[PDB]
């Protein structure tokens, strides 16, 4: 299992390779990446497992800034940060990265 650094979702790593991140892949494009890319945008190290069943009405989800995302498992803390080159590319897309590492 790995955690997406952008949205915090927790999925089996191969999922990040097979389908991309279900919240983020419009900008992250992990589906069409190599393993080095997936491992730079997702972390094997994370803490605080959160079942979010109702994103849009959960206060827990709003605090973690996952209220606009899909129901699923999320992490309170994701270790590592997105590589500066990917942060720069996301910013070109109007996406603002707020690190989830604390």
């Amino acid at each position: 299992e790995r955690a997406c650094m952008l949205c915090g979702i927790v999925l089996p790593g191969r999922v990040f390779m097979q389908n991309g991140c279900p919240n983020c892949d419009s900008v992250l494009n992990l589906r069409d990446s190599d393993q080095a890319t997936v491992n730079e945008c997702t972390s094997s190290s994370f803490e605080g497992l959160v079942a979010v069943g109702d994103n849009e009405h959960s206060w827990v989800a709003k605090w973690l800034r996952v209220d606009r995302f899909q129901p699923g498992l999320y992490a309170v803390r994701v270790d590592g940060r997105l590589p500066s080159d990917i942060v720069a590319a996301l910013e070109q897309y109007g996406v603002y990265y707020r690190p989830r590492d604390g």
């Binding site: 730079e40 605080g48 959160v50 079942a51 069943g53 989800a61 605090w63 590592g80 590492d101």
Partner: protein, 214 residues
């Protein structure tokens, strides 16, 4: 701003529940499966979220509006203590439940794995990706003396001596830099990469011996 996301009286309640130690993540998982499976049916599971903090062993927290939903979420769960032990969390305690939380080149850390477990090391540098850190370490070597290692059957610490290696068993790489048995020694110190998760950066107490040396 994060300050605009603080909880209010209009937000759902949060209950804590006691669970079997080590089974907190499993319970969070099980709650998610139950929630998703019952979505849109005539008997939805009326919880919003559930989570478990590592720092808080043996507890799961569950977000809902009615206590009955908490009982519903846990019904039949073999990892939950049957005693009617759930407890209410105050709104003013919510955000602290979700608090997410070092390492600098030139600083000291203590190694947590391998023959160097427990040894003090200087952080020399970290990988581009950000996972493993190159450490400067006083080596524990035998110069191949009994070749034809563990932390319980290792060697004493002593700076690498390249002339001893030359005599007894070695590749020169630069000024003061040798590769000996596929490890790098510069000016007598091992430089070896460790996972950051394999070093301790906090509350290190230098020993008597370390004060004498460093």
């Amino acid at each position: 701003p994060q300050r605009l996301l603080i909880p209010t009286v209009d937000d759902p309640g949060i209950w804590g529940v006691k669970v079997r130690l080590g089974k907190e993540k499993d319970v969070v998982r099980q709650i998610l499966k139950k929630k998703l499976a019952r979505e849109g049916t005539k008997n939805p599971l009326e919880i919003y979220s559930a989570f478990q903090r590592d720092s808080f062993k043996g507890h799961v927290y569950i977000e809902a509006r009615k206590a009955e939903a908490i009982n519903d979420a846990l019904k039949g769960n073999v990892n939950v203590f049957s005693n009617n032990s759930k407890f209410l969390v105050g709104i003013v305690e919510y955000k602290d439940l979700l608090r997410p939380v070092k390492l600098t080149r030139g600083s000291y850390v203590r190694v947590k794995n391998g023959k160097f477990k427990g040894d003090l090391a200087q952080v020399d540098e970290v990988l581009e990706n950000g996972l493993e850190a190159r450490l400067k370490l006083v080596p524990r070597l035998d110069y191949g003396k009994d070749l034809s290692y563990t932390s319980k059957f290792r060697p004493a610490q002593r700076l690498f001596s390249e002339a001893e290696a030359r005599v007894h068993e070695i590749r020169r790489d630069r000024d003061g830099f040798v590769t000996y048995g596929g490890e790098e020694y510069y000016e007598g110190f091992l430089y070896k990469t460790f996972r950051l998760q394999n070093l301790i950066v906090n509350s290190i107490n230098p020993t008597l011996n370390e004060l004498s040396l460093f």
